[PDB]
Every structure is written in structure tokens, then in C-alpha cells.
Ligand binder design. Sequence first.
Ligand SMILES: CC(=O)N[C@H]1CNc2ccccc2C1
Length: 185
Amino acid sequence: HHHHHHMVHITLDRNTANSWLIISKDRRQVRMGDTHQNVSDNKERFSNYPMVLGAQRFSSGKMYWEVDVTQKEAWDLGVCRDSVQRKGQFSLSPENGFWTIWLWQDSYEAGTSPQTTLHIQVPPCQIGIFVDYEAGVVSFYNITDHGSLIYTFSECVFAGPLRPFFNVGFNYSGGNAAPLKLCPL
Ligand SMILES: CC(=O)N[C@H]1CNc2ccccc2C1
């Protein structure tokens, strides 16, 4: 792809994080802790899942960023509405304000309702995310496989400001402790 020139510097918003998450001092990395991280509860924190939002809000333009997923077994990535539900159980779908892909149990799927199978020959170590607000497009790229397209959500109805969206996943296996990292420009 040729989206690299729309690169934006994303930082994570501590106040939105599930209380188990550890965000690095530079606000560029997040991982699962082995316990509650000794923060107060608030209405913004994701309660049920190890999720966090980026601080940046997008309402126009073209935006691109990259995330490192090396050696993780499970994760969700993409964008969401600023007003997505934070508490209780919910599915990742455009109807609920999320435009995401994920890895789970050795298969990759797009967060449509119902979910769509992805066809990935080279397991990605880094994912590129491209948003065109005006066009209503969210696209995902395999940086490990020379930038090959993973999935395009088109005809998106954002219906609000967008935030970068992250889920580090559960670590019940002991094989998913690795962080999500925002990669340098
Ligand atoms: C080993 C592991 O993944 N433990 C879960 C427990 N439960 C839980 C609930 C919300 C957010 C994160 C978590 C972590």
C-alpha cells in the first residue's frame, strides 16, 4: 500500500484501560498484568475484557498507524466510536461501534456480525491500520508480508468520533503475556 505518509503518533489512554493492564511510561505499549494494577474504578474503564483506547480522537481525514503483535496467541485491533459501551458483555461489531480484526485459537477473523474468516498465509508480527473518515473505510495490512491487504470494511457508518482500539487478550494459557506495541514512524 501507499498509506504510510498518513502516519499518526498514537498514545494509549490510561483512564480507559481495564484495571489489569500495564501501560508503559511512554504510553506506547500495553500488556496484561498478573493482578489488579492498583488504580481506582471509573465509568470509562473496560470492565469485562483487557481493552484500552488510544487518546487521539478522529472526526475527519486519513490516518495510519502500526501495531506489533509478535508472539501473541490472542488480540483484537482496530477503531471504535468514542461512545462504545465500557461495562458488561458485548460483541465487537459495527452495530456496536467497532471496526476490528482479531486472532483467536490459531485463526484470524474480521469483526463483522457474524464474523468473517480472514485468509493469512504469513502470520503477521505487525499490523497496519488505515482509516479514511470521509470515505467510510477501515483497512488492515500485513506488514510482515510486504503490506498485503488483510481486510477492508467499506460503507462504514462511524456515527461519531473514532478512537484507536486495543485488546491484549486473556492469558489463561500462559502463552499470551507479550505486549501490544505501537511501532515507530
Ligand atoms: C489469566 C487471565 O487472563 N486472567 C483474567 C481474569 N479475569 C479478567 C477479567 C477482566 C479483564 C482481564 C481478566 C484477566
